[PDB]
Design a protein around this ligand. Structure first.
Ligand code: FE2
Ligand code: FE2
Lengths: 307, 307
């Protein structure tokens, strides 16, 4: 059985198991030829490298150029949320603006955002430099821990990123973690992953793609976006609620094996009835994963109980 | 409906609702004529007065005379535990000795004990000076918070205390809070209390007396003590497992209205089948309390959810 963390501090092992040779090193990265941007990325990676559970997340002073990039992404996306984002998103966004400094001329600091999520649902952030394995990323969710980038995309192409950057995490992921039902749903995926065989990890990663990253949900008689990758994509957020894509009900035996690509708009989305119903479905799917034990998180001690 | 705290920080209101004119002010208190002891008690009360949730509990340097008193109580009680105390007590006591400094020549500091309980079950301590109302004391349990004295009894009568002192809390109460089932059981009493009418508070206080304070429990085919007031009383701990007292099964419609006195050994004890069974019984009893809502603690946000 694969090793998995049993205490929240044990997530500290992940930082020495990331992909070391990251996207910003590629010839086609928007910032590839910018040595200043290169050094900035390395500085953020070093903060995540040295971070340890329990510490406050170091604050960073963002440059004017970084704030400009943030403000372009923020103001162009914000125009779609009232109409395209789910209720839970719009409900919390004004509080993020009031208490977390979410505004076009200011990049929120992860420590503030983390304390805010803690008050809402117990979720917390940890800074992460580069790409975690699916197993390690998902396992953090068991503890209501979200590994979060601190860096920003290159300012030459503000509307484009080949990777999660701080605009994706804060405008795409964070608002849903403020919701109890969504937090329980995403934690359920994390719990399903612990000690699961690699073959089932890939399936959970695919369910994750079609829910947390690109999911749509029913809302009264309508349909709204909740996936992080939709909420942080101006073009795909408008497309996903148009007549063009195909929609199917969330059905995890099907969703789990569905292929997808990361470089175009999704041709197909799965619709969740609700976050509670998705959570039930994940729980049922997880019972089908060959594991010689069952797992439960204890938030009082921040430990996983293994039976 | 009576006000009750809804967040763990809100327990801070209790400190300005205690009995201000305490037992040490009475002519028959063992330390009454000792002005040094008087000032020492006032110093501990001022620490509890100024304490605020979230802070570390101030450490105190205990005098040699205080440590002597502790060591007499500690060594005389410790001789009974292997035979008279429940398994959960004996299981945790060596770890308290190893990691909390529980030894005859050292009074443990509440901050260390609190961090230890947190790792075990989420329970924490808050220092308390004097007598809380039953409503406020019980309400803290809803949050897995135990209000704990820091002072010690007068050294003139080491085997006697007319009040809870630090020897009672640490040797009587603390070890049971290290057990998950016991923690869930005592929290259930706290939850039952929130917004309950005074008439039901008195009933819950009486159940508390006959369980947390003076309860006995079945253990395999035997019976053992778990009540704090037994575990910190050399004479009553031996008596309670002798032929002299009457024993009855824990039955809360009966137990809740049973009278008792605080100045002699109890003539009657109630036997719990287990802490889980006691917890179930408290939950059922609580549904009988007229409250126009139901309550649940969320350990992720440390808030009470009221429906
Ligand atoms: Fe993402
Ligand atoms: Fe007590």
């Amino acid at each position: 059985v694969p090793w998995f963390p049993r205490t929240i501090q044990e997530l500290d092992r992940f930082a020495n198991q990331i992909l070391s040779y990251g996207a910003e090193l590629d010839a086609d990265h928007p910032g590839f030829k910018d040595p200043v941007y290169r050094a900035r990325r390395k500085q953020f990676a070093d903060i995540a490298y040295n971070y340890r559970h329990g510490q406050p997340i170091p604050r960073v002073e963002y440059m004017e150029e970084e704030k400009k990039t943030w403000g372009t992404v923020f103001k162009t996306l914000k125009s779609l949320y009232k109409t395209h984002a789910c209720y839970e998103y719009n409900h919390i966004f004004p509080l993020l603006e009031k208490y977390c400094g979410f505004h076009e001329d200011n990049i929120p600091q992860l420590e503030d955002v983390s304390q805010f999520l803690q008050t809402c649902t117990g979720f917390r952030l940890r800074p992460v430099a580069g790409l975690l394995s699916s197993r390690d990323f998902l396992g953090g969710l068991a503890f209501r821990v979200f590994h979060c980038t601190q860096y920003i995309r290159h300012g030459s192409k503000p509307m484009y990123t080949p990777e999660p950057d701080i605009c994706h995490e804060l405008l795409g992921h964070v608002p849903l973690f403020s919701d109890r039902s969504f937090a329980q749903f995403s934690q359920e995926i994390g719990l399903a992953s612990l000690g699961a065989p690699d073959e089932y990890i890939e399936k959970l990663a695919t369910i994750y793609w079609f829910t947390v990253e690109f999911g749509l949900c029913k809302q009264g008689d309508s349909i709204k976006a909740y996936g992080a990758g939709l909420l942080s994509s101006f073009g795909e957020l408008q497309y996903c609620l148009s007549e063009k894509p195909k929609l199917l009900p969330l059905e995890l035996e099907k969703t789990a094996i569905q292929n997808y690509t990361v470089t175009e708009f999704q041709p197909l989305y799965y619709v969740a009835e609700s976050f509670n119903d998705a959570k039930e479905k994940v729980r049922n799917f997880a019972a089908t994963i060959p594991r010689p034990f069952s797992v439960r998180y204890d938030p009082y001690t921040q430990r996983i109980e293994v039976l």
